[PDB]
Symmetry: none
Subunit: 62 residues, 6 copies
C-alpha cells in the first residue's frame, strides 16, 4: 500500500439535507426502540466475530 499524489476518501458521508416545517408528530412506545432524527454513520474498519457495526433502532432480547 502506497499512494503518490492521490485524493482518497474512505468511509465518508457528506451533504445530507433535511428540512422540517409544520411537521406534527406523535409517538407512543412500549418497551421498543423508536428513532426520528437523522442518523449518519461513517466508519473505516470493524473487526471481530459476531460484531454489529452501525446499528440504529436496535432491540436485542436474546
Amino acid at each position: 500500500v502506497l499512494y503518490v499524489g492521490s485524493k482518497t476518501k474512505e468511509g465518508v458521508v457528506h451533504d445530507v439535507t433535511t428540512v422540517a416545517e409544520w411537521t406534527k408528530e406523535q409517538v407512543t412506545n412500549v418497551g421498543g426502540a423508536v428513532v426520528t432524527g437523522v442518523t449518519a454513520v461513517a466508519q473505516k474498519t470493524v473487526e471481530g466475530a459476531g460484531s454489529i457495526a452501525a446499528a440504529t433502532g436496535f432491540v436485542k432480547k436474546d
Copy 2:
C-alpha cells in the same frame, strides 16, 4: 496496491435530500423497532463470521 495520481472514493454517501412540510404522523409500537429519520451508513471494511453490518430497524429475539 499503489495509486499514482488517482481520485478514489471507497464507501461514501453524499447528496441525499429530504424535505418535510405539513407531515402529520402517528406511531404506535409494542416491543418492536420503528424508525422514521434518514439513515445513511457508509463503511469500508467489515470482517468476522456471523457479523451484521449496517443494520437499521432491527429486532433480534433468538
Copy 3:
C-alpha cells in the same frame, strides 16, 4: 503503508444539514429508547469480538 503528496480522509462526516420550523412533537415512552436529535458517528478503527460500533437508539435485554 506510505503516502507521498496525497489528501486522505478516513472516517469523516461533514456538511449535514437540518432545519426546524413550527415542528410540534409529542413522545410517550415506557422502558424503551427514543431518539430525535441528529446523530453523526465517524470512526476509524474498531476491534474486538462481539463488539457493537456506532449504536444509536439501542435496547439490550439479554
Copy 4:
C-alpha cells in the same frame, strides 16, 4: 453620459479557472517568444494611431 441606479462593468475579466496535475512540459526556444501561463488582459480605453493593445507572445522585427 449619466447613470442613475445602474450597475455597469466595463472591461472586466473574472472567474477564469485552470488546474494542473502531472503536467510534464518541455520547451526549446531560439530567439522567439513562448508563453505558458494564463494571460488575462482587461482594459477600458486605448488610443493612438498604430498602437498595439493587449499583445501577448509578441515578436517585432521590423
Copy 5:
C-alpha cells in the same frame, strides 16, 4: 459624465484561479522571452501614438 447611485467597475480582473501539483517543467531559452506565471493586466486609460499597452512575453528587435 455624472453618476447617481451606481456601482461601476472599469478595468478590473478578479477571481482568477490556478493550482499546481506534480508539475514537472523544463525550459531552454536563447535570446528570447519565455513566461510561465499568471499574468493579469487591468488598466483604465492608455494614450499615445505607437504605444503598447499590456505586453507580456515581448521581443522587440527593430
Copy 6:
C-alpha cells in the same frame, strides 16, 4: 465629472489564486527574459507617445 453615492473601482485586480505542491522546475536562460511568479498589474492612467504600459518578460534590442 461628479459622483453622488456611487461605488466605483478603476484599475483593480483582486482575488487571484495560485497554489504549488511538488512542482519540480528547471530553467536555462541565455541573454533573454524568463518569468515564473505571478504578475498582477493594475493602473489607472498612462500617457505619452511610444510608451509601454504593463510590460512583463520584456526584451528590447533596438
